[PDB]
Design an enzyme around this catalytic site. Sequence first.
Site, PDB file in Angstrom:
ATOM      1  CD  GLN A  19      -7.726 -31.498  31.758  1.00  0.00           C
ATOM      2  OE1 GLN A  19      -8.346 -30.686  31.112  1.00  0.00           O
ATOM      3  NE2 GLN A  19      -7.326 -32.654  31.271  1.00  0.00           N
TER       4      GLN A  19
ATOM      5  CE1 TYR B 203      -4.869 -26.167  24.552  1.00  0.00           C
ATOM      6  CE2 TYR B 203      -5.550 -28.378  25.177  1.00  0.00           C
ATOM      7  CZ  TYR B 203      -5.806 -27.190  24.527  1.00  0.00           C
ATOM      8  OH  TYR B 203      -6.992 -27.020  23.885  1.00  0.00           O
TER       9      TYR B 203
ATOM     10  N   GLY C 111     -15.637 -39.282  26.666  1.00  0.00           N
ATOM     11  CA  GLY C 111     -15.794 -37.838  26.419  1.00  0.00           C
ATOM     12  C   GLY C 111     -17.173 -37.553  25.842  1.00  0.00           C
TER      13      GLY C 111
HETATM   14  C1  LIG Z   1     -16.151 -30.640  23.605  1.00  0.00           C
HETATM   15  C2  LIG Z   1     -14.870 -31.304  24.063  1.00  0.00           C
HETATM   16  C3  LIG Z   1     -14.054 -30.663  24.968  1.00  0.00           C
HETATM   17  C4  LIG Z   1     -12.865 -31.244  25.440  1.00  0.00           C
HETATM   18  N1  LIG Z   1     -12.131 -30.590  26.414  1.00  0.00           N
HETATM   19  C5  LIG Z   1     -11.081 -31.241  26.921  1.00  0.00           C
HETATM   20  C6  LIG Z   1     -10.369 -30.690  28.031  1.00  0.00           C
HETATM   21  O1  LIG Z   1     -10.763 -29.678  28.652  1.00  0.00           O
HETATM   22  N2  LIG Z   1      -9.333 -31.446  28.554  1.00  0.00           N
HETATM   23  C7  LIG Z   1      -8.895 -32.582  27.989  1.00  0.00           C
HETATM   24  O2  LIG Z   1      -7.870 -33.145  28.507  1.00  0.00           O
HETATM   25  N3  LIG Z   1      -9.513 -33.122  26.919  1.00  0.00           N
HETATM   26  C8  LIG Z   1     -10.579 -32.491  26.421  1.00  0.00           C
HETATM   27  N4  LIG Z   1     -11.303 -33.064  25.398  1.00  0.00           N
HETATM   28  C9  LIG Z   1     -10.941 -34.403  24.923  1.00  0.00           C
HETATM   29  C10 LIG Z   1     -11.712 -35.480  25.706  1.00  0.00           C
HETATM   30  O3  LIG Z   1     -11.313 -35.553  27.108  1.00  0.00           O
HETATM   31  C11 LIG Z   1     -11.501 -36.877  25.087  1.00  0.00           C
HETATM   32  O4  LIG Z   1     -10.104 -37.245  25.128  1.00  0.00           O
HETATM   33  C12 LIG Z   1     -12.007 -37.032  23.657  1.00  0.00           C
HETATM   34  O5  LIG Z   1     -13.342 -36.537  23.573  1.00  0.00           O
HETATM   35  C13 LIG Z   1     -11.986 -38.456  23.129  1.00  0.00           C
HETATM   36  O6  LIG Z   1     -12.782 -39.310  23.942  1.00  0.00           O
HETATM   37  P1  LIG Z   1     -14.191 -39.840  23.379  1.00  0.00           P
HETATM   38  O7  LIG Z   1     -13.958 -40.578  22.041  1.00  0.00           O
HETATM   39  O8  LIG Z   1     -14.761 -40.710  24.493  1.00  0.00           O
HETATM   40  O9  LIG Z   1     -14.968 -38.575  23.144  1.00  0.00           O
HETATM   41  C14 LIG Z   1     -12.489 -32.493  24.933  1.00  0.00           C
HETATM   42  C15 LIG Z   1     -13.292 -33.108  23.963  1.00  0.00           C
HETATM   43  C16 LIG Z   1     -14.487 -32.542  23.549  1.00  0.00           C
HETATM   44  C17 LIG Z   1     -15.343 -33.248  22.526  1.00  0.00           C
END
Ligand SMILES: Cc1cc2nc3c(=O)[nH]c(=O)nc-3n(C[C@H](O)[C@H](O)[C@H](O)COP(=O)(O)O)c2cc1C
Length: 353
Positions: A97, A177, A307
């Site tokens: 990414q 972003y 995530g």
């Molecule tokens: C600790 C953490 C860091 C994240 N960092 C990013 C990131 O670097 N890039 C991004 O596009 N999304 C980032 N996200 C969002 C996740 O990619 C994802 O969209 C979000 O956790 C929801 O999915 P989930 O319900 O499966 O956790 C982050 C989420 C968490 C919890």
Amino acid sequence: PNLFDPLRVGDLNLPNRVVMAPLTRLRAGPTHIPNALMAEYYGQRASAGLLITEGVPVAPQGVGYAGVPGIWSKEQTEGWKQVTKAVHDKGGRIFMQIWHVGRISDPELLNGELPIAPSAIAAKGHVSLLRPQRDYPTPRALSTEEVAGVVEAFRQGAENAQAAGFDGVQLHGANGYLLDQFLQDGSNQRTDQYGGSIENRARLLLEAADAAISVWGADRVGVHLAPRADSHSMGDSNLAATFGHVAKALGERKIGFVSAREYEAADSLGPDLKKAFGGVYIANEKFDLASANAAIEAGKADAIAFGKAYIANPDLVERLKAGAALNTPDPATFYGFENGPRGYTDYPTLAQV
Ligand SMILES: Cc1cc2nc3c(=O)[nH]c(=O)nc-3n(C[C@H](O)[C@H](O)[C@H](O)COP(=O)(O)O)c2cc1C
């Protein structure tokens, strides 16, 4: 199909449709050089159909968090080689990414410089993780020629990811972003070729995508979106037309995939974006085993990124296949170089002997 069925995505055959979502962990620290712990971490998760890295800033100007890795330098590129080797040695697939935070930063992370943006409009609320707590600053609006500078930083980042042995790159077009700041009319009030129509607002994202395509080929490029505009003070007066335009433009380019952070609700644009895109659509946000299976069986998504479940469960694919209990994520160790392995490489697998 279901979550366990293979899927061709660009030039890759994924053995399953479980994707690791991009997750910022800040385990690189102040040198921004990737390390052997990060290599182990991605190698632990290599049974995924596809891994997506943490956001990786393409320039120091794109840094929003202390301890982020970079992809602008040769020494950073060398450090990432350990990560791609670790994943490939376990027969996995990984995209980087590539990222620029724009206005979502603080001058203390940018050597006293203002964060940059399409328009001098501060995001609401406080900078994440920094103490003591402070509001986001009003950013500096780029000149038209400095926007070409941003595209060049994305191009060089796509080049270095390639030299580091990645299978492709995903543009961070999501979560308020820089690319998302340009895309949405809440944050973009420019009057040059980058503002004032959906075509112009999508131009920076699509130029960055075309830079990645020239390095990688369309098959090895993805784009990440957040069509609900619910993070980092986003908002647009016509999200359906804005995101629809992006989906259709990326589809005309025949890129590998579109991914979207967007939980399922009656107001989801995902099914419409998948249709407009015409290619592989990776859904994400609050999915579980049953809802992932149901979405793929209904043709609402081709694959599902997890995530927080991937933070806590290195063997997530095996746990989902087995309907086994999931480890509970520990939010106190999501972020922070200081943590090292703790809440990073030390979550248990089902294996005991
Ligand atoms: C600790 C953490 C860091 C994240 N960092 C990013 C990131 O670097 N890039 C991004 O596009 N999304 C980032 N996200 C969002 C996740 O990619 C994802 O969209 C979000 O956790 C929801 O999915 P989930 O319900 O499966 O956790 C982050 C989420 C968490 C919890």
